Structure formats: structure tokens, C-alpha cells
């Protein structure tokens, strides 16, 4: 979905694959601005764009260079920005 | 992080584990309101709270009731809401 471009806190996606890291298809979400884009399309700095991060499971060989069964490692990946305020409403 | 409560588009989390589904620790993010909470703490309905969804890998036995190696199935999970507008800024 095109939420990345139409959100108040828009984000850009950055694909990656380290020599041993699997899967290859992982687009890391990075916030466009410090502030948020108000209804008038301007950036307001009394609000902040923050990336929502998810703890999940990714494929990794140990010992390396193996095309079989092994133990999978940890992965910390931001998947989308949101607009926060210092106030708990 | 407490972004879920301090975001303009706040969300509630809903934990689950189906009889065969693994891992047990999966909190599904659900949006609190249709509209977004403006700077003044009010809901504005010319903006919408949308859940950011992530396509990822989850543990599943086939044939069922097996504590060994098998093929893992598909999982569609919303991890956090964001505030959208019909305008592409």
C-alpha cells in the first residue's frame, strides 16, 4: 500500500541482503522528516515521525556457507513511521 | 516503546496462538479510531488511522503434531497504525 507516501509521517524504504543473510527481500523503513506533515502539507516540529520496529525471525547458516537445516538468528527491522507527540492523550 | 499510546493514530495490541500456530508471542495491532487525534487531542475525520502490515515467516507443522523440522507457512500481521490523508503531499 502507498501509505508510505500519504502518511503524516512519511517513510522511504531501503532494501538489503548481507553476503550470508536470508531472505534477500527485506526493505528497511526510514523516516523522511523529524517533524510531521500537517493537514496543510507543512512540517510541524512539535510532533515527531518515529519508526515502528518489529522483532522477528530471519534465515542464517551457522557454520556459514550451508544450504541445509541450522539455527536462525535475531532481526530488528523498522517497517513504518508514525506521528508522535510528547502528550499522552 | 509507548508509541501505541502517544501516536496521532493510536493502536491497541491483541495477543494470539492458534492450537498448532507458533510462536505463541504475537500481538496483532488494531487501530483505536477511524480518524486521527489532532494536536488539540481531538479526533479529525478528514484523516484516517491505517494499520501498517508486514509479510513475514512463522513456525507451522505439516503433518500436524510434530516437534521436529518441516515447512513454515505464511503470516499477515499488522504491527502499528499510521495517519493518512487522501492527499499525496
Amino acid at each position, epitope marked *: 500500500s502507498d501509505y508510505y507516501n500519504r502518511s503524516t509521517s512519511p517513510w522511504n524504504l531501503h532494501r538489503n541482503e548481507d553476503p550470508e543473510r536470508y531472505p534477500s527481500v527485506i526493505w528497511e523503513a526510514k523516516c523522511r522528516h523529524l517533524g510531521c506533515i500537517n493537514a496543510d502539507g507543512n512540517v510541524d516540529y*512539535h510532533m515527531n515521525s518515529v519508526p515502528i520496529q518489529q522483532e522477528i525471525l530471519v534465515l542464517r547458516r551457522e557454520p556459514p556457507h550451508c544450504p541445509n537445516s541450522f539455527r536462525l538468528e535475531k532481526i530488528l527491522v523498522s517497517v513504518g513511521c508514525t506521528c508522535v507527540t510528547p502528550i499522552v492523550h | 516503546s509507548d508509541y501505541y499510546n502517544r501516536s496521532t493514530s493510536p493502536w491497541n495490541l491483541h495477543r494470539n496462538e492458534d492450537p498448532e500456530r507458533y510462536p505463541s508471542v504475537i500481538w496483532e495491532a488494531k487501530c483505536r479510531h477511524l480518524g486521527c487525534i489532532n494536536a488539540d487531542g481531538n479526533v479529525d475525520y478528514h484523516m484516517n488511522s491505517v494499520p501498517i502490515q508486514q509479510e513475514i515467516l512463522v513456525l507451522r507443522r505439516e503433518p500436524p503434531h510434530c516437534p521436529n523440522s518441516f515447512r513454515l507457512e505464511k503470516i499477515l500481521v499488522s504491527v502499528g497504525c499510521t495517519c493518512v490523508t487522501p492527499i499525496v503531499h
Partner: antibody
Amino acid sequence: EVQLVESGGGLVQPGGSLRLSCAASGFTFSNYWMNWVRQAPGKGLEWVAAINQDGSEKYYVGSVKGRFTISRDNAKNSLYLQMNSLRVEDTAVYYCVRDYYDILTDYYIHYWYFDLWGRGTLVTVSS
Amino acid sequence: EIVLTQSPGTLSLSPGERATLSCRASQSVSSSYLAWYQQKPGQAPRLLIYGASSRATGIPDRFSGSGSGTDFTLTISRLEPEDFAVYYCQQYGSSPCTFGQGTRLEIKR
């Protein structure tokens, strides 16, 4: 004994830079959000910037967009404000302040009010 | 941006009297998130009232808070010499936080 000590004031020319420093003595700094609130000689109180516990979030007043930068150092228990391209309207006494936090269950609740203030330094922007 | 207007600009009263301070908000202040601060010449502000009605740590019983939404009141029931200072209200329900322009309490004689 719980105190806040500002430093870094002084005369600056229009277009200049300054860096205010605030020493947060007598309490665990990492636990609180901090802010810079200014007061023009005689005029009232005005919020300048705010900062998250770890600096993950930096909030600013419209007038200081891309000119001022709040920053902290939980190890050196200090808060700083980087004031660039200073305009005469920036003439004021700047206070560093501590933001009241509460804990209901296992959840930290930040409130944008100031239970502790500093003595403030006077920044003068003139030719 | 919520705009707080305080009345009067300056209040001349004698110790023993009851001071009634007003803070009028341009918009409804969320969950009555309003604070009141005291400020003596040369010194830095001091928190008195939070959540529109709650007295801060150490603040004497004589200080009272009232209000909800747009109209908020600070009351000092039996005035003492150390109560004669400038008074600011501040809201923390709308981002950004804004302050009242102030009301000074002068010792009428």
C-alpha cells in the same frame, strides 16, 4: 539539593552562534524529558524545544526551525541547546527544565509540565 | 495552538484577602491538563497547581485550583506577603505547550 545550572549566555552578533549548557545535579537525568523555555526581558514564558529521555525525539518551536538544536549527554548528566543564526528576537533568559513523569503500572507517563527549573542564562543578540 | 489569556493584567490586594486568578483558553484544554506557576522578580518559576486542581509537592493549603475545558481559576484564600508575585498558567493538553501572558499580584495599601 536537586538542581539545574545553566551556562552559555552572553552577547552575540545578529547571525551568530551559542551553545547553552545545563548541568542537572542531584537526580537520575536519564529518567526525565528536558526542555528549553525562554523569557524576553520583561515579557513572558515561551517554550523553545523539548527532548526525549535518550534523544530519540527532538521537538521545536516554529520560530527556531533548523536554527536551534537541543541535545543531551546522559553520561555527562547535561543538556545543551545549539543556537545558530541568532536573530535579535532571540534576546531572552533561557531556562532548562525537568518534565514531570509518573508511572501507573509498568508504563512511563510523560507530562509536558515543569516540576523543576534552573536559574537561566541571559542571551543577548545585538550589533 | 491553544491561546491562554489571563485576567487581570495586574491585581492589587491586601494580605488576608482572597485572590481569584483567571486563565481563559482559546480551545478546550484536553483532560484538564493545566498547570499554574509563581514567579518572584529575579527568581525562576515554581510549580503550584497541576491537572487544573491538584497542589504540587510542598504547596500550602491556601493555594486552590479550579477549572475545566476553557475556563480555569487559581485561588489564594488568605493572602500572605510571600504570595505576592507573577502568576503564569500553562497547558499541557495540546501540542505545543503554551503559557498565559501573566498576572502580577501586588500588595495593595
